[PDB]
């Protein structure tokens, strides 16, 4: 079956769970900063735990089990408003790099690896605020990992230096697992280690 879309608070953490309804998937909030996702073929899905509001500079730690089979990613993921922006700091991915086709904005070194920076624009697409036009900011880790600390400030500073607007009002900021026409399992624990 498929866990219905949901967003809110659980055990002191914010969470977001979303799927297009085409995939078979079960999303479960576990205790504290832990969540679990099991998915099969059929569509796009993304869920995870974190904070709301996000910060430009948060030290985010993640660890656990990440076992995709096909198209999938593990990322720090969130939104700002004014302007409306969807951003991704991608720590690991299954088969294809989700930033493919983005405009190349160069590289930066954060938390022990080079990250490739990029941006794309989504026109009349689904957003937290309905159908809107908005940019996506990408920072994609060269040395893939399943645990560690992300200092988000390193990436926001990098996007700013490239000329992107990072002054919006923060909405949620979570460590998300995504699947796209694939199967997999994830059990991820998030924490602020500032």
Curated annotation (Swiss-Prot):
Activity over temperature: Optimum temperature is 60 degrees Celsius. Thermostable.
Record EC number: 3.2.1.8
Catalysed reaction, written as an equation: Endohydrolysis of (1->4)-beta-D-xylosidic linkages in xylans
Pathways involved: Glycan degradation; xylan degradation
Keywords: Carbohydrate metabolism, Disulfide bond, Glycosidase, Hydrolase, Polysaccharide degradation, Pyrrolidone carboxylic acid, Signal, Xylan degradation
InterPro entries: ConA-like_dom_sf (IPR013320), GH11/12 (IPR013319), GH11_AS_1 (IPR018208), GH11_AS_2 (IPR033119), GH11_dom (IPR033123), Glyco_hydro_11 (IPR001137)
Name of the protein described by the UniProt record: Endo-1,4-beta-xylanase
Gene: XYNA
């Amino acid at each position: 079956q498929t866990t219905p879309n949901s967003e809110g608070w659980h055990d002191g953490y914010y969470y977001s769970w979303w799927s297009d309804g085409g995939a078979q998937a079960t999303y479960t909030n576990l205790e504290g900063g832990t969540y679990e996702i099991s998915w099969g073929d059929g569509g796009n899905l993304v869920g995870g735990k974190g904070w709301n509001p996000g910060l430009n500079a948060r030290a985010i730690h993640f660890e656990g089990v990440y076992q995709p089979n096909g198209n999938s990613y593990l990322a720090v993921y969130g939104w700002t408003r004014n302007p409306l922006v969807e951003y991704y700091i991608v720590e690991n991915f299954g088969t294809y790099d989700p930033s493919s086709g983005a405009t190349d904005l160069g590289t930066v070194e954060c938390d022990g690896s080079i990250y490739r920076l990029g941006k794309t624009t989504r026109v009349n697409a689904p957003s937290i605020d309905g159908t809107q036009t908005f940019d996506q900011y990408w920072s994609v880790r060269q040395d893939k990992r399943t645990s560690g600390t992300v200092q988000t400030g390193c990436h926001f500073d990098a996007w700013a230096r490239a000329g992107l607007n990072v002054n919006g009002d923060h909405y949620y900021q979570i460590v998300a697992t995504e699947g796209y026409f694939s199967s997999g399992y994830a059990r991820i624990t998030v924490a602020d280690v500032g």
